[PDB]
Amino acid sequence: SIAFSRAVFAEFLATLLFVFFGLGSALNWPQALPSVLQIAMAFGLGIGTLVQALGHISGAHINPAVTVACLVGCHVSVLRAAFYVAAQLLGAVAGAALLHEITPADIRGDLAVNALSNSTTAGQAVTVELFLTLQLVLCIFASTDERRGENPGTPALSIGFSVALGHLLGIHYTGCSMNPARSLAPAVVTGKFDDHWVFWIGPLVGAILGSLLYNYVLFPPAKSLSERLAVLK
Amino acid sequence: SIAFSRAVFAEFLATLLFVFFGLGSALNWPQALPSVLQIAMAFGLGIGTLVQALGHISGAHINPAVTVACLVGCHVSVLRAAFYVAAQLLGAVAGAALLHEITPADIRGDLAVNALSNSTTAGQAVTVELFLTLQLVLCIFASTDERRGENPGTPALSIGFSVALGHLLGIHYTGCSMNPARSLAPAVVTGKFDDHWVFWIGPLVGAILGSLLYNYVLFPPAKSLSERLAVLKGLE
Amino acid sequence: SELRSIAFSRAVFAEFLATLLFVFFGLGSALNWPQALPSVLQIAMAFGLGIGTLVQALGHISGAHINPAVTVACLVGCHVSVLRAAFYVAAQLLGAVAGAALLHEITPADIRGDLAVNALSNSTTAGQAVTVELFLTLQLVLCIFASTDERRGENPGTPALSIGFSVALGHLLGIHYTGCSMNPARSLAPAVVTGKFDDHWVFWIGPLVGAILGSLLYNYVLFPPAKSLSER
Amino acid sequence: SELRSIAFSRAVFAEFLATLLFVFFGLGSALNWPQALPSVLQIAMAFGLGIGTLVQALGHISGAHINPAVTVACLVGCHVSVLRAAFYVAAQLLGAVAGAALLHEITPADIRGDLAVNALSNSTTAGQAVTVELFLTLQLVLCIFASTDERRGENPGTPALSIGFSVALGHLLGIHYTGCSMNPARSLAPAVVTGKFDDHWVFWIGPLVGAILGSLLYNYVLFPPAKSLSERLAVLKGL
Numbered sequence: 001s002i003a004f005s006r007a008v009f010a011e012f013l014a015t016l017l018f019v020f021f022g023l024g025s026a027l028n029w030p031q032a033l034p035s036v037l038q039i040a041m042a043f044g045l046g047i048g049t050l051v052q053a054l055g056h057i058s059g060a061h062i063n064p065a066v067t068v069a070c071l072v073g074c075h076v077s078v079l080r081a082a083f084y085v086a087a088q089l090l091g092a093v094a095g096a097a098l099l100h101e102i103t104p105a106d107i108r109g110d111l112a113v114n115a116l117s118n119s120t121t122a123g124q125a126v127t128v129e130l131f132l133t134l135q136l137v138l139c140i141f142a143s144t145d146e147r148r149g150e151n152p153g154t155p156a157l158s159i160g161f162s163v164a165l166g167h168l169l170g171i172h173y174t175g176c177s178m179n180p181a182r183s184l185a186p187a188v189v190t191g192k193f194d195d196h197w198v199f200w201i202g203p204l205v206g207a208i209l210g211s212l213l214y215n216y217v218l219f220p221p222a223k224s225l226s227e228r229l230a231v232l233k
Numbered sequence: 234s235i236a237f238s239r240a241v242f243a244e245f246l247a248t249l250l251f252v253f254f255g256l257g258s259a260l261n262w263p264q265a266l267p268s269v270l271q272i273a274m275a276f277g278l279g280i281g282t283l284v285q286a287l288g289h290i291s292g293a294h295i296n297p298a299v300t301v302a303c304l305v306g307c308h309v310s311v312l313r314a315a316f317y318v319a320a321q322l323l324g325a326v327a328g329a330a331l332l333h334e335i336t337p338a339d340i341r342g343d344l345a346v347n348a349l350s351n352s353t354t355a356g357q358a359v360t361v362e363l364f365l366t367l368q369l370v371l372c373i374f375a376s377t378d379e380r381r382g383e384n385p386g387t388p389a390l391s392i393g394f395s396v397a398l399g400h401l402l403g404i405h406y407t408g409c410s411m412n413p414a415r416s417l418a419p420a421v422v423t424g425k426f427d428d429h430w431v432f433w434i435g436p437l438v439g440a441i442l443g444s445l446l447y448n449y450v451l452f453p454p455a456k457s458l459s460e461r462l463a464v465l466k467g468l469e
Numbered sequence: 470s471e472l473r474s475i476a477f478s479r480a481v482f483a484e485f486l487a488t489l490l491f492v493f494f495g496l497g498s499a500l501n502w503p504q505a506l507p508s509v510l511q512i513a514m515a516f517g518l519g520i521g522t523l524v525q526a527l528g529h530i531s532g533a534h535i536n537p538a539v540t541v542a543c544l545v546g547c548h549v550s551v552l553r554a555a556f557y558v559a560a561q562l563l564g565a566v567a568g569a570a571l572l573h574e575i576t577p578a579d580i581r582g583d584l585a586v587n588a589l590s591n592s593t594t595a596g597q598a599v600t601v602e603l604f605l606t607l608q609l610v611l612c613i614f615a616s617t618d619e620r621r622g623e624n625p626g627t628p629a630l631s632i633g634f635s636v637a638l639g640h641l642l643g644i645h646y647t648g649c650s651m652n653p654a655r656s657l658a659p660a661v662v663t664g665k666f667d668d669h670w671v672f673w674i675g676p677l678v679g680a681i682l683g684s685l686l687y688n689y690v691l692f693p694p695a696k697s698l699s700e701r
Numbered sequence: 702s703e704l705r706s707i708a709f710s711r712a713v714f715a716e717f718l719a720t721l722l723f724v725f726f727g728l729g730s731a732l733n734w735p736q737a738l739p740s741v742l743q744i745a746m747a748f749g750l751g752i753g754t755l756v757q758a759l760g761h762i763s764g765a766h767i768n769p770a771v772t773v774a775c776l777v778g779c780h781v782s783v784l785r786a787a788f789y790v791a792a793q794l795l796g797a798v799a800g801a802a803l804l805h806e807i808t809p810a811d812i813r814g815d816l817a818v819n820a821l822s823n824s825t826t827a828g829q830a831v832t833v834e835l836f837l838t839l840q841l842v843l844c845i846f847a848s849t850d851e852r853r854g855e856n857p858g859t860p861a862l863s864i865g866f867s868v869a870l871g872h873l874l875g876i877h878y879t880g881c882s883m884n885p886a887r888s889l890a891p892a893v894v895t896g897k898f899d900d901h902w903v904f905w906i907g908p909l910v911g912a913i914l915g916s917l918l919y920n921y922v923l924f925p926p927a928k929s930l931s932e933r934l935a936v937l938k939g940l
């Protein structure tokens with residue numbers, strides 16, 4: 001019960017730091033405007049650092065889509081999943097509110113809200129988000145799969161570079177979400193809810209798809225005591 | 234029986250995601266045109282992520298030239314090699330067709346097709362493509378070698394950074410191929426086939442060269458007794 | 470012991486040489502070169518790969534702190550004597566100023582400029598800036614503490630690259646506010662060399678409070694030592 | 702003898718091929734400036750990922766020095782014989798010139814230019830430049846020695862990435878002063894091909910002195926090997 005509180009607090013603090021660093025590096029700085037690689041790197045090294053710092057404490061999900069993928073995959077409970085999602089949404093909004101406070105009003109702008117970009121339709125955008133989140137979930141699962149042992153070698157860096165990879169494509173379409181908490185945080189703070197469902201449906205469907213594809217298509221477990229049913233039939 | 238189907242599906246899905254992410258990061262030019270480092274990084278982190286995610290399930294070739302190189306020192310049969318190459322070509326075209334569908338019409342353009350750049354001749358270009366794939370094949374062979382030292386595990390980041398390295402040079406000459414499936418995918422979707430043989434001959438010759446150089450010249454592997462007999466009995 | 474004695478001298482010398490090289494490379498890459506002005510990613514990468522290279526090269530010799538704020542975090546956290554902490558902080562401040570003085574004498578006079586001093590940027594107030602510096606150093610210590618946690622013995626992990634990328638991460642945000650410090654020695658070094666002490670306390674209070682916060686958060690809240698025989 | 706063994710021939714060939722590929726990729730990414738001029742980070746990354754890839758591919762075969770300064774650092778630090786050191790240096794210089802000559806052949810005449818030769822930049826004096834080159838090669842050699850240190854536990858690939866990022870780090874500073882050498886073979890290769898030898902001694906004295914300094918500092922001052930079989934047990938009793 002104490003260990004669970006430490007895990008929920010870690011999930012809160014991780015999303016707080018991720019959103020604070022992520023959005024802050026993505027803001028329109030007039031003296032030196034951030035590049036697609038620079039932003040991809042900020043979110044990428046953000047996740048990679050927090051997985052390194054907090055992975056052994058909570059699993060370092062830092063994303064409700066990842067927690068949901070984990071609910072379908074990891075032997076996690078619906079109780080832990082709810083407490084994690086709630087901690088991530090609270091941590092994210094706290095990170096976006098904290099950043100607002102420390103950033104001068106002139107720069108703040110859209111506070112790096114997820115917005116449909118380059119005349120992309122919501123239907124085209126929801127499809128990108130699905131694939132952006134699918135590849136992250138595939139990588140996260142492979143990097144943390146206990147059956148693999150110490151073989152992944154670089155889980156934090158791999159997971160981090162997967163977030164960066166998502167951003168190198170995603171930025172052009174939606175500003176890149178892959179995370180419902182990262183989307184809700186600046187949307188709640190700076191009132192902007194433009195096609196918000198895309199940043200929820202996309203990541204969540206992509207995460208569930210990736211979780212089902214990994215755990216039951218690509219690398220499923222061996223047959224359980226359900227084989228006794230096939231013997232009885 | 235199931236394991237082989239899972240491996241072929243992984244090879245298909247890996248090339249689908251690689252081509253989708255790779256090309257998509259190389260086109261997308263509004264009031265933010267992608268840089269050589271940005272593109273190198275997209276293809277590089279693309280392969281690295283996919284080797285990490287799918288290596289343990291298929292070997293994560295994601296390249297017909299890599300599968301061909303592996304036909305000499307990866308314990309890949311001609312049957313598996315054919316099924317992998319077919320899965321990669323199908324996955325790649327599916328990734329390029331999917332990207333076309335999701336990208337607004339005006340941005341699409343060439344769809345990041347491999348094309349001769351900065352007035353480079355096809356002969357000069359095919360030589361670049363040979364060396365770009367030779368170093369990649371050299372890195373994959375060492376990275377998957379039990380004798381390379383370290384602890385068990387595949388360095389997915391090392392392989393990824395080899396792809397990025399290839400792009401830092403290759404972009405200027407051909408838009409960097411190193412992968413015949415990555416070349417065919419936007420060529421089939423768009424209809425552009427200008428100097429298409431360079432993107433097949435270059436990676437394939439470079440891969441076979443790197444495979445022969447590693448396995449016969451540089452670090453000849455330890456033969457099992459059955460393999461050794463395939464050589465001995467397969468003489469006089 | 471004699472063996473134990475040489476080891477401490479090697480550690481203090483490594484901390485000196487590490488801060489010398491870090492400040493020399495870091496500031497030098499951040500200078501306003503006219504032919505090619507450095508980008509936020511380029512600078513983040515210079516300081517990032519700087520710490521990562523030094524952690525790789527010197528970690529097994531001193532712990533590769535290269536920062537008085539992290540040295541202070543090991544005092545409250547990874548419980549070390551006040552003697553080593555003082556010798557490390559003194560070595561880092563000496564190494565840093567030596568690195569900044571060496572760089573000054575290596576760069577032509579025209580391009581030296583402000584010598585990459587930490588300065589309040591984009592009209593950020595000192596109070597807003599000290600809050601940024603707190604959070605930049607907090608994430609760094611959290612990452613350092615986990616990468617070097619005694620309990621993380623077995624699998625080596627990637628401490629040098631991870632720590633390196635955590636410094637780069639802090640720069641991708643921090644550059645816009647203060648030019649990014651996260652390190653009181655990196656701030657003092659060009660300030661002593663080129664007399665520019667504008668809002669200097671921010672670059673001391675920010676990193677130090679952030680480091681102590683991260684050390685207390687890791688050792689008392691997040692991952693404390695086991696209180697009893699329950700799990701030891 | 703060492704000379705008449707297959708393994709030694711493979712190591713010398715590996716050192717030749719590594720310098721060939723390094724110089725070919727490195728210079729080519731630094732000179733290619735038509736309607737897309739390369740940035741300091743882009744070039745740093747090309748040379749950086751170049752060394753990292755080659756250390757990964759060839760490290761287990763020859764030690765992947767790809768640099769006469771590194772070979773010299775290893776000579777001073779008792780890792781290689783004077784015979785192997787000579788054969789490595791000769792292979793690196795031959796490989797480098799072959800890599801620059803090959804690149805010249807494949808690059809259109811309009812973009813070749815000075816072929817990314819090391820040249821004193823931003824009005825830096827040769828004395829200031831030789832001091833930079835010393836510190837660039839010193840940190841590199843410090844990283845190489847730790848990355849190939851049997852006493853240090855690491856995960857697969859990470860030592861080659863660390864050496865690679867050390868080369869990039871050097872370039873992020875060095876580019877502004879000399880175009881960043883850290884390697885006498887990388888300097889000689891386009892100088893022989895293009896015919897430009899302006900302040901060439903800096904690119905030899907700088908890296909060689911920096912490498913010897915780093916080798917002596919690591920092996921004698923910072924982290925020397927054990928002297929006795931009882932040394933590690935003598936440390937253990939301090940609990």
Ligand SMILES: [Zn+2]
Pocket residue numbers: 774775778780781
């Ligand atoms: Zn050596």
